[model samples]
Structures are given as C-alpha cells and as structure tokens.
Target: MPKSLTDPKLLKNIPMWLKSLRLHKYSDALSGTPWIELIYLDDETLEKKGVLALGARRKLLKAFGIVIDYKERDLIDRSAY
Candidate 1:
C-alpha cells in the first residue's frame, strides 16, 4: 500500500506545489464574484517559497483587486530564511 501523505517527502512537496500554483496564478473561480478571485495552495509549495513568499503576498492583494500588484512580486522571498 502507498504510505500515508504524512511521509516527509510528500509533506515537503505540498508547499512547493502551492508556491508554484501561486507563482503561476492558478486561481479558482468563485461564484457571484465578477471582480474577485481565489487561489488555493498546498503545504509543500508554501514551504519551498517560505511562508512569506511574494506569491502569497501578491495573492492577498490580488484577491482584493488591488492595483500596483506586479506579477514579478510572485518571485520567492528567500529572505524568509
């Protein structure tokens, strides 16, 4: 049988994938919201980019339709180390 998701590699990959999703702007559509967007991220991607990755920061502002939010902001925040 396949090991549980709790395996270290799987756990580590979650945040990495999430960071990738955010970097790629892989947003999910929300009903009844013409000008709003939502995005989902797993744990591994989140870790690879660090908890305060620029992708995450942009996600917050973009969700609220904030201007001046550059796509380059999606770059990983290595300083988080």
Candidate 2:
C-alpha cells in the first residue's frame, strides 16, 4: 500500500510532504531531498532542485519556515545632522 503523509514513517518523507501540500508536481525534482535538508533550502537551492517558479519557491520556503536573510540598512550618520 502507498504510504500516507500522516503515517509516522512518512511524516519526514519529502515526496509525501510535497504531495500533501498539493505540490506533488515537484516530487520528481525533489525526490531525493530529506526533511532536514528541506528546512535549509533557500531560493538558490530550490532553483537547483528544479523548483524554478518563484511562487512555488515562496510557498515551500513559507511552509518550511525558512526565512531568507536580508542586509540591514546602514545607520544614519548622526554627525551630519
């Protein structure tokens, strides 16, 4: 029988997780990925994984709680004020 997402063993399965999220279309591309690696996948990594769509990348990152790091704005020069 096919494994369900809710199954304990399949809970950490990448393909099953994608299927549950209705993103099974990417299963082939991301088949060998593991749950632990999924959490660290950034935009570039996702791109390498064949998930080229920005929308899909966002969905995956959002679902995985993987926040992209951003550069902080430079502090204003108080001496110039």
Candidate 3:
C-alpha cells in the first residue's frame, strides 16, 4: 500500500523488500501485470517527486481514460487510435 494508507517510515523502506522479492523470483506471483513490482514510498516522497496519484478509481479513469468497449479488438483499437 502507498504511504497514504500506511506508516511513512515503513513505506520509505519498502523498496528493499521489493528488491528481495524480485531477487527471489516472486514478482510474477505478486503482480498481476507483466514486469510490475510492488514498492512503497513515503507520501512526502511521492508529493515531492512522483507524478500524479490515481488513488481514486475515478482519478485513474480521468488520467488514463477508460474504454467502454469491452471487446478485445475494440479496446485495442481505442488504445491504438
């Protein structure tokens, strides 16, 4: 979880845990998406250096825009176009 949802100190040190998990080859099981890894950071760190936060589902939708077309081809077409 992000620091917004957890202790800041613990969040700040989460990268080490993430690295260890990756080294142990558990990244694939932990993340549903390809090549994605879980890492935590302080909320202040995020505010100072990270890009926009999509904490809310609506915010994510607004940032990336959602495709209503559920068909695989339509979704791919919309993404490409």
Candidate 4:
C-alpha cells in the first residue's frame, strides 16, 4: 500500500536529498519537461542515504506523484514533458 509523508523535516529535505544523491542522473537532459511524473528512491539509493523514514519515502513519492530496482533508477512518471 502507498504511504503518505507527514514529517515536516523529511518533506523539506526531499529535494535536497534528490539533488545531493544524484537523482538528476536519472533525469532527462535531452528533452523539455512539462508533466506530472512519478519518481522513486530505490532500495539502494534509499539505503545509501539511510533514508529509513517512511515519511521521507512518501514525501519523495509525493514529490513526483513516482522507481527502479537497481543501478538504473527507473522513473514511473514525470511532470516534465
């Protein structure tokens, strides 16, 4: 079941965590963006950041409205078009 993030601190840190951990690497550098896409922090990335907070997890999912299972973080949806 999908969870909701309510932690203010974790919510505030979602963007920081993404950029800091290189979520952009999975971002599109080739085309323009404009849509509500889905994004996620896989088990590894989440573990790497020690992001065990369920609030943080939901916060991230809420961020993109979005994962992968491995080295290539697969995005399920995105607002960028």
Top model by TM-score, which number? Answer: 2
**TM-scores for every predicted model:** 0.19, 0.63, 0.18, 0.27
Best by lDDT: 2
Decreasing TM-score order of the candidates = 2, 4, 1, 3
Q: lDDT value for candidate 2?
A: 0.60
- Tell me the lDDT of candidate 1: 0.32
Better model by lDDT, 2 or 3? 2
Candidate 1: regions farther than 4 A off? 1-51, 66-81
| Candidate 1 per-residue C-alpha lDDT over 25-80 given as tens digits, one digit per residue, 9 for 90 to 100 | 32222222221122233344334334346555455344323211321253323322
How does residue 51 of candidate 4 score in lDDT? 46
The ten-residue window of minimal lDDT in model 2 covers 67-76
Model 3 residue pairs with clashes: none
- After superposition, which runs of candidate 4 have C-alpha atoms over 4 Å from their true positions? 1-40, 66-81
lDDT of 2 by residue, 1-81 (tens): 122333323335566667766778998887777654565688999999999998888777775652112101223122212
Q: How far is each candidate from the true structure, as Cα RMSD in Å?
A: 15.4, 14.1, 15.2, 11.5
- lDDT by residue (1-81, candidate 3, tens digit) is 211212223223343323432322332232332111122323343334332343522222221222222222242322222
